[PDB]
Every structure is written in C-alpha cells, then in structure tokens.
Amino acid sequence: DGPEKNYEKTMAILQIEAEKAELRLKELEVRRLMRARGDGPWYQYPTIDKALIDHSPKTTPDN
Amino acid sequence: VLKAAAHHYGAQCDKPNKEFMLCRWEEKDPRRCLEEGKLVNQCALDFFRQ
C-alpha cells in the first residue's frame, strides 16, 4: 500500500499506547492515594454496621 | 416495710416516681435528676405519713 497508510496507523497506535501509559501512571497514583487516605470507593475495609445497635430502653438507666 | 406497702405506694406515688424514671432514662446522668429524686422521697414520706 501507500507509505501514508503505515504513517497514519503508526500515529493511531502511538496515540493509543501513550493514552495507555498515562492511564497506567494515573491508576497507580490513584490507588496509592486511595490506600493512603481511604477516602475513595477502593480500599473501603468494612466496619461494624450501626443497624445492629439496639436503641431500646435497657435495664439500667445510665444505658 | 417497703414491700408491704409497695402495691399501694406504686399507685399513690405514681406521678413523681414516673417523672424521675423518665428523667433518669432521658438525661442518662444522675446529676441532671437530683431535684426529681428529692421529690420522690418527699412524696414517699407523705405516703407513709397518711
């Protein structure tokens, strides 16, 4: 084929691979920050559910 | 002595005793219901006086 076909295919491939590399670095930074802070949807280790607490009159008045 | 008069004591001194119980079970602090606790003894003494 023409020399321009390989040129444009190479440009598309380079764009895709550069986007992949940037996304990989972004993902690594995001994962590190989420693990360090725990303020995102990832690394949300479970805690005690507050629906188990019994909010009813107990025996002793001081609860 | 308290147990013998307990049934009548609960009926006659119901009003001040229930207020103190509500206070203790809403404040959850004995220092926030001392005044209501004093009224329990005053009504309890008045119950035995009769």
Side-chain angles (χ1 to χ4, degrees), chain B:
Chain B
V1 179
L2 282 177
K3 192 175 186 181
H7 272 68
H8 284 102
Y9 170 78
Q12 305 305 321
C13 299
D14 185 291
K15 186 60 180 179
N17 292 8
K18 292 293 184 176
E19 295 205 15
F20 172 74
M21 292 278 88
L22 182 60
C23 187
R24 290 290 289 100
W25 253 118
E26 285 189 348
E27 298 291 337
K28 298 170 183 177
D29 176 88
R31 312 163 303 187
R32 298 298 161 265
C33 305
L34 293 178
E35 196 63 34
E36 289 78 11
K38 292 189 165 55
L39 302 183
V40 169
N41 289 253
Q42 298 182 2
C43 193
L45 293 177
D46 295 1
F47 173 82
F48 285 107
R49 286 187 179 100
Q50 306 183 29

Side-chain angles (χ1 to χ4, degrees), chain A residues 6 14-15 22-23 26 31 34 36 40 42 44-45 47-48 53:
Chain A
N6 188 40
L14 287 171
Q15 179 199 32
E22 296 170 0
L23 287 181
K26 215 174 188 181
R31 292 172 68 181
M34 289 208 195
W42 303 340
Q44 292 294 324
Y45 302 114
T47 51
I48 311 300
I53 302 181

Side-chain angles (χ1 to χ4, degrees), chain A residues 2-58:
Chain A
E4 338 91 3
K5 176 180 181 178
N6 188 40
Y7 204 79
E8 312 293 7
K9 287 178 54 181
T10 303
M11 295 190 63
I13 292 175
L14 287 171
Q15 179 199 32
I16 294 179
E17 296 299 328
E19 290 186 1
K20 287 185 175 181
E22 296 170 0
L23 287 181
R24 290 191 192 98
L25 292 177
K26 215 174 188 181
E27 176 194 358
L28 286 183
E29 187 64 31
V30 165
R31 292 172 68 181
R32 184 188 69 87
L33 293 178
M34 289 208 195
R35 185 150 190 164
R37 303 171 180 177
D39 55 356
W42 303 340
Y43 296 94
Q44 292 294 324
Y45 302 114
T47 51
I48 311 300
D49 188 8
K50 74 174 184 179
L52 297 178
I53 302 181
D54 191 9
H55 298 281
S56 61
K58 311 295 183 300

